[PDB]
Curated annotation (Swiss-Prot), chain B:
Changing F6L: Increased resistance to neutralizing antibodies and human covalescent sera neutralization. Residues 35-48 are annotated as: Disordered. It comes from Severe acute respiratory syndrome coronavirus 2. The gene is S. The chain holds residues 485 to 532 of 1273 of the full protein. Attaches the virion to the cell membrane by interacting with host receptor, initiating the infection. The major receptor is host ACE2. When S2/S2' has been cleaved, binding to the receptor triggers direct fusion at the cell membrane. When S2/S2' has not been cleaved, binding to the receptor results in internalization of the virus by endocytosis using host TFRC and GRM2 and leading to fusion of the virion membrane with the host endosomal membrane. Alternatively, may use NRP1/NRP2 and integrin as entry receptors. Changing H35P: Increased resistance to human covalescent sera neutralization. This is Spike protein S1. Changing Q14R: In strain: Omicron/BA.1, Omicron/BA.2, Omicron/BA.2.12.1, Omicron/BA.2.75, Omicron/BA.4, Omicron/BA.5, Omicron/BQ.1.1, Omicron/XBB.1.5, Omicron/EG.5.1. Binds to host ACE2. RBD also interacts with the N-linked glycan on 'Asn-90' of ACE2. Cleavage of S generates a polybasic C-terminal sequence on S1 that binds to host Neuropilin-1 (NRP1) and Neuropilin-2 (NRP2) receptors. Interacts with host integrin alpha-5/beta-1 (ITGA5:ITGB1) and with ACE2 in complex with integrin alpha-5/beta-1 (ITGA5:ITGB1). May interact via cytoplasmic c-terminus with M protein. May interact (via N-terminus) with host bilirubin and biliverdin, thereby preventing antibody binding to the SARS-CoV-2 spike NTD via an allosteric mechanism.
Length: 48, 48
């Protein structure tokens, strides 16, 4: 997300044994990266 | 030529040229302020 010109990254690596879909349950995600990028973001892409 | 000159001229910088012609290294610090999160700040004075 980008709020107040601040880019935030959250993560969680809980083990998942259901390969079909995300199992029912709750898991909060801790913050990892708090870099103030300052570049407006309107598009997204993924690397493989 | 007579009316054509090289845009760049070289310093003398002789060892005995004297103050006012001796080389001086200048570092100019410019403070950029914008509507972006602040990244550079003065030290936080830590006390016991």
């Amino acid at each position: 997300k980008n709020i107040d010109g601040y880019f935030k990254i959250y993560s969680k690596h809980t083990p998942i044994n259901l390969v079909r879909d995300l199992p029912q349950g709750f898991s909060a995600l801790e913050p990892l990266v708090d870099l103030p990028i300052g570049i407006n973001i309107t598009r997204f892409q993924t690397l493989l | 030529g007579f009316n054509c000159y090289f845009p760049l001229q070289s310093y003398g910088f002789q060892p005995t040229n004297g103050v006012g012609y001796q080389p001086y290294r200048v570092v100019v610090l410019s403070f950029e302020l914008l509507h972006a999160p602040a990244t550079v700040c003065g030290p936080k004075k830590s006390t016991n």
